[PDB]
Amino acid sequence: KHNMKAFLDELKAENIKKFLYNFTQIPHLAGTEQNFQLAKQIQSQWKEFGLDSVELAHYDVLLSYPNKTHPNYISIINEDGNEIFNTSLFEPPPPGYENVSDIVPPFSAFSPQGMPEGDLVYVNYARTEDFFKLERDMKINCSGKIVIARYGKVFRGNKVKNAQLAGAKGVILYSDPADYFAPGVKSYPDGWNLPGGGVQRGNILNLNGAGDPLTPGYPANEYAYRRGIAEAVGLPSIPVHPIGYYDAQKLLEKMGGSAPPDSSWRGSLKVPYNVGPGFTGNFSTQKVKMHIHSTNEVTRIYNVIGTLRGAVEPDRYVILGGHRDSWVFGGIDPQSGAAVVHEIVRSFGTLKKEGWRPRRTILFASWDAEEFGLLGSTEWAEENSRLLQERGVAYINADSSIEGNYTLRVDCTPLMYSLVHNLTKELKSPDEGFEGKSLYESWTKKSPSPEFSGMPRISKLGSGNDFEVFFQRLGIASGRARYTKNWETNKFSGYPLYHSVYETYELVEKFYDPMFKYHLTVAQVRGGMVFELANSIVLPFDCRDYAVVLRKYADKIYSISMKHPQEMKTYSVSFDSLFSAVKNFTEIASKFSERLQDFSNPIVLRMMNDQLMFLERAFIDPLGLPDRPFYRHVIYAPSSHNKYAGESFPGIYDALFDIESKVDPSKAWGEVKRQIYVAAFTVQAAAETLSEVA
Amino acid sequence: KHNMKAFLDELKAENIKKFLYNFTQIPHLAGTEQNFQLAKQIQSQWKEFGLDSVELAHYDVLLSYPNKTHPNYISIINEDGNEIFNTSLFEPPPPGYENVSDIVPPFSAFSPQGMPEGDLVYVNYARTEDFFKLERDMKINCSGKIVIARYGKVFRGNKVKNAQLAGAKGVILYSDPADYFAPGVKSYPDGWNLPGGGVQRGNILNLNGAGDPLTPGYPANEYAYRRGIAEAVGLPSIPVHPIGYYDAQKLLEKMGGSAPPDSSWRGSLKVPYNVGPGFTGNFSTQKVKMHIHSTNEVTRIYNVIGTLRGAVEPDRYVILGGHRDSWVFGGIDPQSGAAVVHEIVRSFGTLKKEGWRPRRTILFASWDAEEFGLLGSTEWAEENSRLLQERGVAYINADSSIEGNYTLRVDCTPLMYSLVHNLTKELKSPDEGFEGKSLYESWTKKSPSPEFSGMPRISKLGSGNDFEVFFQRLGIASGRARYTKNWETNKFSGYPLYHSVYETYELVEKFYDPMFKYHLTVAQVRGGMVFELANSIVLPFDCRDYAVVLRKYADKIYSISMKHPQEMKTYSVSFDSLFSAVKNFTEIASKFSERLQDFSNPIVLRMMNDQLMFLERAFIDPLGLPDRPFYRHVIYAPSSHNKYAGESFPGIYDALFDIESKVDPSKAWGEVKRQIYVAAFTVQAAAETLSEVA
């Protein structure tokens, strides 16, 4: 028969391994010819696998590259002007790697050019709260300084933006072994740890959901009008460069000024972690000089889009997508997800050749230039927003399959919680000590919900990956799932080798998943979801799950506001309307669930499914959030302090953040009230899309 | 049987006459108790007629009223400060009208308060081109002057805005007999002409699609956050008052300064129509003083919403709506439309009681506060935008049924042209000399298309009535139809008694339509459309008609740009992309029409109908037009020079308007190119919603 189990069993660990190997032998940097070749290979294999159509969708987008003959680097410069120490120009490449000249050296994509010289200030992780600790408690001024920050905790582009707002003239980012060196494991190539010469690449955009910085709102197609560089959407305005911990130890060890405020400011290097500004005594005359010569250039990128037409509802789209472009070899990020996606397409194509079709249309995407700020997925979604708005059922992301081997990790809309729960109860746990047991049980045991026991943790979507435009801008239900580490604490840092040249096929095969069993599990979760979304007669969304979390979120934002009881009284700040809306939503959603069990008639079915599909859409505010016209979801947005994290009721949360330091409290609290009204009105409106239609 | 002819024949002239009489015996000003009583009467009668549900939807919106004990008026003041002439405080009420104290005196709704004194400048109709003629050819400066303008040609709120931008400190509006006195007919009550003491009321908002000036984007519900008056959306910033031609003759006759530039500046009064500034010689010391004491107040308004649930597609909505609030008695505007709407509901209720239901759901609306800037329809649409976006098939307006008795007048989306054509071929002409002939033939004979012969004229939708939010903001196909005069030239002026106290039941019954045959025709057109939209198996929209007009519009905007050939070369201004998009649209639309003839299967039908319904939606740009976030339709917007007129490719047209006077031509032409790209991308995107879905 042609059912989900047939689909799950066609997925093989060995095929995923063949694909991962094939996809990671050379670099696939966005905009390069090698990446275009891999696109043509995907396209032509997805045709062989059996898809109805497979096409390249190209865009000309702003990309960023180092200058091949004027390399980026940082110096310590002395009084006479002599460069007495220089950071490295490239990472020592991994063992057996031949075409070296083609490996992009470490750089921060989208840094402007510049040669600033100054005194160093160490800002910890450069989080909003680290800048508050520096300027407000220690009274240390960053204006005109170079800040050195460690990677981790928050998206690197937030760090750069915090440094800009504090007046810095440059940013050095580095990987501290506290965050990137798991005790008791060896450095690559003998272990999965970061060596001293390894360096994390990555864009430092001030992400705002726009996609190509030159064409916000519209696809970067052939006749596109482009903004000038000066009006470009999220480009940083100070030079930025990343280094490894050997180079960083050389910069940090001379530092003076004030002691670190406490030990959460210390990493593991053998240095005092002085905050600065400047070096101590003997070296107070030395300076740090950055040399950044990277260039911005409009470059062609290619998305592969495969279509598997639905038998019954070909005008309803379930999308499975992940990116193909990598910084270097992309051993984990993204080819461990791309390999899983290839095995899923192969498996759907098999059933297709035996005469089966999904009920709904499935779209498979291999996105380009995700590493440069989600450009391939975002341009495609701007091009097709009208089709996606009226037709998109769900989006499943498939970037990295693993990032550890301890347990499952899932972020998705509440509409998909019950789907995820049911699917994982029917899947085998691949974990040692859990054979015979379900994936749900191992997952629940190792990663418990902080709210309800007997349930696993599912997180909120923010930004940082290609689901972002589907979910935050268009309001299409979205989800992602991968295998992860035990280390809850480092959950936004990346694994040790994240974005460095050492992420290779050997890394995955020797240290992560020799049997490819974690990849197989992940393929089963992402394929299984896509299968159910695409084939279930009633869409597998449970609106009652949205009712439950809305009430946690409302309780939470109310709690944050109540740290200011006197202002709540003086300005009449009331959450009554928002609680009433969440109550109405709870009521209407449970009446709706009953009718959904209690109705054969294709029109009634299409109408109920349309209520389910459009329910996520109903949380979209067409005016967007304040100053953020492309963050339109009123319940979720990327956190303004950490684009990797989702924030709930983001409009109210931003109006409240640091509200005590607003100079006009009447106008600040007026803006909180406005956002309560917007959130209340939107919850009620969404609820009324689930009422009887007439 | 239960078909369209049964529906058409249940409509009776005599019922419309009973309703018109009932609806016009007392004033129904928005926000008054009398208007609320009429709402309760409508609601309870629509229940009797047979609707499934009828509810009041209330909002608290900014309204504007004169001060009952400090009346508005204008003076001529002498050097000593004595007011030597005063305009009247009320219009002489019509014969037999009892409750006088309750008739709102003439005022311009939303004028701020003020007592400016100054010299008069006469600005003709105060159109953009009249201000260009004054300041640019005659070199006359309006700054610090009171402008006196005649009503006509363009929406009064454009006049006030032109006067503000030119530096005026006040505006006097008046009705000139050239525009409001049809030669050879008597003044009311003996004819349908405006008497010397009659005065046109009306709002002077700077309309921008927002609805309630205090709550743009969101419904003015009970917990709404309101902007302060200072940030309010389209409120004028100078005092404005309307007068009749007796009072105006007194203001105009003393005027001096320069002669009128030509005769298109002269009305019919016995005065020289001098432009000013100031009076001649002997009276150069006299001044004009305005006394404006009107107040803005947040007032409750009530929409009546009736639902007739569909038998097969209850989640698809066809809306028939018109307003109920009037300035005074509303003899023509709006009760001649409301009476027709009541007769349509009665007729649908009759079939309903015999067991018939429409295939789609029908919604009937009696909107409030349309006269104060479309507030009832707009707030309701902000409240229900999510339901309307995903479910709205079409909106049919029903303000005034007649405004003359010569021939039919229709404005609608191209998607409805073929529907209008077919329906009117099946309707009788009520015109003398055309008995036995179809409404299409009389209409075509009296009002020919300027493009194709054998077809009648159909105009573009702008603003000025309650369809606006449905069409310009939400992209729901919209239409309107009424009986009109021969006078093509005065097509934006209103009929002579427009918005004055003389628009009464007797006016209509004695001078417009004694037999109520024109109202019956109009009921048949608006009911017929609603019937077809609601009951036809394939939605009666023809996308090939959109392809034809897009190409006229493209030719037209290209022509306007080509008055600047040298700049087109220097800045590489190319319309190639837009012509290619219109060509693709033509091609795809005709392939689509073929599949539409060549397909029983309910899902295939629902999918094709959804392509038709969403086709209007596909022209919506979620970013809106520049500075106009609520004008979102890329093909149509109200004209920036005349909110009553529709402009096609409004983004490009505004970027081009007066482009030679832009100080930075590079930046101005860069903005034209940007708009060509937006229009090209949107036509192509709309076209691709009609492709095979997969």
Ligand SMILES: *[C@@H]1O[C@H](CO)[C@@H](O[C@@H]2O[C@H](CO)[C@@H](O[C@@H]3O[C@H](CO)[C@@H](O)[C@H](O[C@H]4O[C@H](CO)[C@@H](O)[C@H](O)[C@@H]4O)[C@@H]3O)[C@H](O)[C@H]2NC(C)=O)[C@H](O)[C@H]1NC(C)=O
């Ligand atoms: C959640 O669902 C509930 C109930 O289903 C919904 O209730 C609505 O609440 C509003 C109040 O916010 C009610 O409004 C009232 O309506 C009546 C007429 O029906 C009016 O008489 C009332 O006005 C008087 O009272 C006001 C407040 O005291 C005065 O300011 C005003 O001047 C009047 O004197 C009042 O407007 C409305 O009837 C109900 N709807 C119902 C019961 O169906 C609630 O709003 C929903 N929550 C959210 C956040 O949407």
Ligand SMILES: *[C@@H]1O[C@H](CO)[C@@H](O[C@@H]2O[C@H](CO)[C@@H](O[C@@H]3O[C@H](CO)[C@@H](O)[C@H](O[C@H]4O[C@H](CO)[C@@H](O)[C@H](O)[C@@H]4O)[C@@H]3O)[C@H](O)[C@H]2NC(C)=O)[C@H](O)[C@H]1NC(C)=O
């Ligand atoms: C209306 O429909 C038509 C046809 O159905 C659609 O045609 C598209 O036009 C674009 C050009 O605007 C084509 O783009 C080309 O695609 C090929 C690969 O398929 C590339 O090789 C081309 O790039 C080269 O040429 C460029 C221009 O000379 C260079 O700048 C570039 O560096 C490359 O060397 C080029 O991008 C596209 O293939 C077709 N699509 C088709 C034929 O299906 C047209 O765009 C539609 N009109 C609108 C306004 O959308």
Ligand SMILES: C=CC[C@H](NC(=O)N[C@@H](CCCCNC(=O)c1ccc(I)cc1)C(=O)O)C(=O)O
């Ligand atoms: C737009 C950003 C490009 C790029 N994106 C990217 O490198 N994404 C990785 C991020 C890895 C570290 C943080 N991890 C998470 O934020 C996370 C969220 C949900 C799940 I299930 C698992 C991890 C990525 O998303 O894989 C970057 O961050 O430089």
Ligand SMILES: C=CC[C@H](NC(=O)N[C@@H](CCCCNC(=O)c1ccc(I)cc1)C(=O)O)C(=O)O
């Ligand atoms: C928001 C405006 C409120 C009010 N609206 C209003 O008074 N609308 C009337 C306008 C009558 C004169 C201009 N006529 C037209 O613009 C027109 C357009 C299409 C057709 I078919 C017929 C006439 C109204 O729309 O009836 C006003 O204009 O003061």
Ligand SMILES: *[C@@H]1O[C@H](CO)[C@@H](O[C@@H]2O[C@H](CO)[C@@H](O)[C@H](O)[C@H]2NC(C)=O)[C@H](O)[C@H]1NC(C)=O
């Ligand atoms: C990855 O896999 C593909 C397909 O299995 C290999 O590409 C094929 O290579 C052979 C030999 O060059 C050709 O005959 C085919 O034209 C290719 N098939 C395609 C492009 O679909 C590819 O070379 C493998 N890559 C690596 C690095 O092993």
Ligand SMILES: *[C@@H]1O[C@H](CO)[C@@H](O[C@@H]2O[C@H](CO)[C@@H](O)[C@H](O)[C@H]2NC(C)=O)[C@H](O)[C@H]1NC(C)=O
């Ligand atoms: C770091 O790199 C710089 C630049 O390549 C070195 O400084 C240059 O050295 C050569 C040879 O002494 C000079 O002729 C150049 O003019 C120097 N350039 C600059 C910009 O200073 C520097 O010697 C290196 N430092 C170390 C410690 O290796």
Ligand SMILES: *[C@@H]1O[C@H](CO)[C@@H](O[C@@H]2O[C@H](CO)[C@@H](O)[C@H](O)[C@H]2NC(C)=O)[C@H](O)[C@H]1NC(C)=O
């Ligand atoms: C996940 O599984 C549960 C339990 O099997 C599903 O809930 C049941 O669904 C059937 C079919 O409608 C009902 O008749 C049972 O009463 C439900 N049991 C419950 C709610 O405890 C649930 O619907 C599934 N969720 C999906 C597929 O989204």
Ligand SMILES: *[C@@H]1O[C@H](CO)[C@@H](O[C@@H]2O[C@H](CO)[C@@H](O)[C@H](O)[C@H]2NC(C)=O)[C@H](O)[C@H]1NC(C)=O
């Ligand atoms: C307009 O028509 C309605 C209904 O035909 C009249 O209202 C009814 O009046 C009688 C006598 O007051 C009452 O018994 C009913 O309660 C009313 N029906 C309603 C409100 O639905 C109304 O009075 C007429 N108005 C005028 C001005 O003639």
Ligand SMILES: *[C@@H]1O[C@H](CO)[C@@H](O[C@@H]2O[C@H](CO)[C@@H](O)[C@H](O)[C@H]2NC(C)=O)[C@H](O)[C@H]1NC(C)=O
């Ligand atoms: C126009 O109206 C004004 C205001 O009502 C008249 O001026 C007032 O007249 C009385 C009696 O003479 C004075 O005591 C007031 O102080 C005057 N008020 C103002 C504001 O001037 C004026 O007389 C009227 N003019 C005409 C020609 O009727």
Ligand SMILES: *[C@@H]1O[C@H](CO)[C@@H](O[C@@H]2O[C@H](CO)[C@@H](O)[C@H](O)[C@H]2NC(C)=O)[C@H](O)[C@H]1NC(C)=O
């Ligand atoms: C208006 O009437 C025309 C002519 O009757 C309709 O066009 C015909 O429709 C039938 C049914 O699909 C076709 O088979 C004929 O070939 C059509 N004749 C033509 C195009 O000349 C037209 O569809 C009607 N338009 C509506 C209801 O929107």
Ligand SMILES: *[C@@H]1O[C@H](CO)[C@@H](O)[C@H](O)[C@H]1NC(C)=O
């Ligand atoms: C790279 O190096 C130098 C910098 O001036 C020069 O040869 C070239 O312009 C640079 N390459 C660029 C800007 O693409």
Ligand SMILES: *[C@@H]1O[C@H](CO)[C@@H](O)[C@H](O)[C@H]1NC(C)=O
């Ligand atoms: C800090 O930095 C510079 C010193 O040059 C100064 O201009 C700026 O105002 C200072 N701000 C604070 C809060 O000290």
Ligand SMILES: *[C@@H]1O[C@H](CO)[C@@H](O)[C@H](O)[C@H]1NC(C)=O
């Ligand atoms: C894989 O799991 C094993 C067993 O716990 C362990 O040796 C290793 O640390 C894991 N690999 C990674 C990359 O975490």
Ligand SMILES: *[C@@H]1O[C@H](CO)[C@@H](O)[C@H](O)[C@H]1NC(C)=O
């Ligand atoms: C109307 O007239 C006077 C103006 O000061 C006063 O009695 C009253 O405030 C006014 N009414 C208003 C402002 O509603």
Ligand SMILES: *[C@@H]1O[C@H](CO)[C@@H](O)[C@H](O)[C@H]1NC(C)=O
């Ligand atoms: C016109 O009006 C005033 C005169 O007071 C002046 O300030 C303004 O600049 C003038 N503009 C022109 C174009 O004459």
Ligand SMILES: *[C@@H]1O[C@H](CO)[C@@H](O)[C@H](O)[C@H]1NC(C)=O
């Ligand atoms: C109604 O039509 C007749 C005949 O042409 C004419 O007397 C009259 O002017 C018309 N009424 C109006 C209001 O135009």
